[model samples]
Target: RTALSPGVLSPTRPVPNWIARPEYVGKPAAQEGSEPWVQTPEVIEKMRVAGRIAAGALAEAGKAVAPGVTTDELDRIAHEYLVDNGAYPSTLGYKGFPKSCCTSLNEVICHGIPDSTVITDGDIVNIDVTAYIGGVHGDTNATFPAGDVADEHRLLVDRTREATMRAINTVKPGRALSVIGRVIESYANRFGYNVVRDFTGHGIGTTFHNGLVVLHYDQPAVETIMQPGMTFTIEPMINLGALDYEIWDDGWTVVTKDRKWTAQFEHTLLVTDTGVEILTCL
Candidate 1:
């Protein structure tokens, strides 16, 4: 459910074309020909059920976050919830990833594997989840405070959410993918924050991930137009320090190069003929 290159610790390598773009250094690319093809109405309905389950898991996990709780506990809770709801944690074993959900804390940008690390007051954590049911998938993520985070941390979280909503609002058929980056980057820059260039959003659907990987920061001109039936994610990881990032020895966790806090929010969206539907919101 997350994009990664061949060598675990090396960032200057290219992942499979179906997984990520080679041009953007560490950013993920959309899966080619991996777009969801829900031919029957039943497929869409099943996807909705899966999405609701994933959303519910995130909501419950948010409520459970506290100073004393461990990231592994949160992951266990999410995994149990998804199982109880008859859905599977899509990231459990995908691409050698070990956890059920991603629990990124403080300076960690994304793909932070859940562990025994205890949540502390003033720490901000981003939990990313993806669930599967009936062969369909739903992806969603949110950033939350462990307890009493600093004002700047809270602002980063709120602004990141705002940037996501702004991009969602602008989504409609015939829109360009670049528009998303424009809106997201503008808001982050205005607040003197930097969008993490190491990671970008991507397409998601029945196949787990698919085309037109969306970048949160401005990039050279590319002509990947949005259209109806397209499904993807618009996750913007904003940092309070330098835009540069580093990978942990684990080969999955990404942290801000300056060691400053970061926040992120994500949702899988489906482009419709008229507008767009946020599949992971409900």
Candidate 2:
């Protein structure tokens, strides 16, 4: 039931820098058949700046995550923060997406559209924030407790973070991208959880989704090795129940098939000669 890519467009703030905007803003993503853009010395620094800006935007939005707050308000928190900082909210109008950020509540794995959905106590939500600046893009996401999440739900979110961090820790030059999902799935499986397969992490930089696709399940190991100056996101979405998922009629909202709880963690990473640099961290 679940499918690829993103969702419908609605009323949201426009990119403050209306001039020199990318052509694909209101259009669909261009990564389906494109090649990944390798970052140069100059472009990598731009990405680092954009990554830090995006990290701040998500952090500001995450601070508003509490009971009685609307997901749309959470989107606004990110939108205003990015605009105030001179970076564009990369999610807005990209592929016709409406919100400035993505706020996924319980049972929603990824790309949960931000509307008037009220988050209450005992709920957990994932806020995905991205920023485009210096002609490059930076992306990161994290799940947070609304007020007082149940013990099991908190454990689920924490384990998802652990799995994602473990996968990221495996990144280095000459390492195969397949090893990422291998490590991630192993950790989740050890904790008695399933990795969501409907959506995969992606190579992100100038475009929201660059050509490289980061899968979250085990596959025959491929030979696509990591390299210096290459950038991508390692967002592992985990489910407490089945790995199966379904999409809503809206086309972008992906949810668990069994309506069980799910959580996710994401980060944009830059590969260094020695190790990986978490671009979206402060």
Candidate 3:
């Protein structure tokens, strides 16, 4: 119900030198370089640490979400948490993104920059956190209810979370990667929601967005199969209205074309011999 105008962004936060940063940091373009999709045992252990840091940072950010709080304040909480844990805020300075994490409020779909915009009551905002530690990256996000959320807005947040979990439950070795999208799309449709197809989950390990494209809609063309030790993310942005979207001139912010609210959830995962491991969790 709330349509956001881009707000003034604070200066880029600083990261200490000891934290391990991705190669793309300070680069003009975000290169889609390589990182192993099926990770080795050593790398999986590293990713697990990275995921935990990301999850913890997200929790800190969510706790600060409420009316009268600036989105930039939330970023500060997450940014400090990541650095204190000896992890790099994965989104910062990567391809010139200024913030440590993304804050998407109301109609915004994803990549909503953290800025001076004040969160108001009855709004839902999504905080996306990624931490790079132990030489790998862990990514996750969830929408939080700000103040007293209306019934419709609460439904969007709760259903989006459920859709993400249902999709995660479908992961395993030998399953088609497209199955992730199928499960998510099917679940969202039951509540009259549409999946935003603009962004897809990606394979992550040593490099952020490590080449593996995880679609959120049933795509027959995505023939990739899940394999043991494989790692990737499953983030589906579900909308309460039309799926069409528009990008702000800022180049990083995204919102719904219909000006209706959207919600999203995400997690980095590892395919086990029989099932999957949710890497981004406490």
| Clash count per candidate | 1, 0, 0
What C-alpha lDDT, on a 0 to 100 scale, does residue 48 get in candidate 1?
Answer: 72
Sorted on lDDT, highest at the top, how do the candidates line up?
A: 3, 2, 1
* Alpha-carbon lDDT, every model: 0.76, 0.84, 0.91
Weakest lDDT window of 10 consecutive positions for candidate 3: 27-36
Cα lDDT, model 1, residue 129 = 87
Give the winner by lDDT.
3
For candidate 1, write residues 135-155 as lDDT tens digits: 777889999887788888888
> Model 2 misses residue 146 by how many Å?
1.1
lDDT for 61 in candidate 2 is: 87
The better candidate by TM-score, 2 or 3, is 3
Candidate 3, residues 135-205, lDDT tens digits: the string is 78899999999999999999889999999999999999999999999999999988889998879999988
* Candidate 1, superposed: residue stretches over 4 Å from native: 1-43
lDDT of 2 by residue, 126-215 (tens): 999988888888999999998878899999999999999999899998888899999999999998999877688888777777778888
Q: Which candidate, 2 or 3, has the higher lDDT?
A: 3
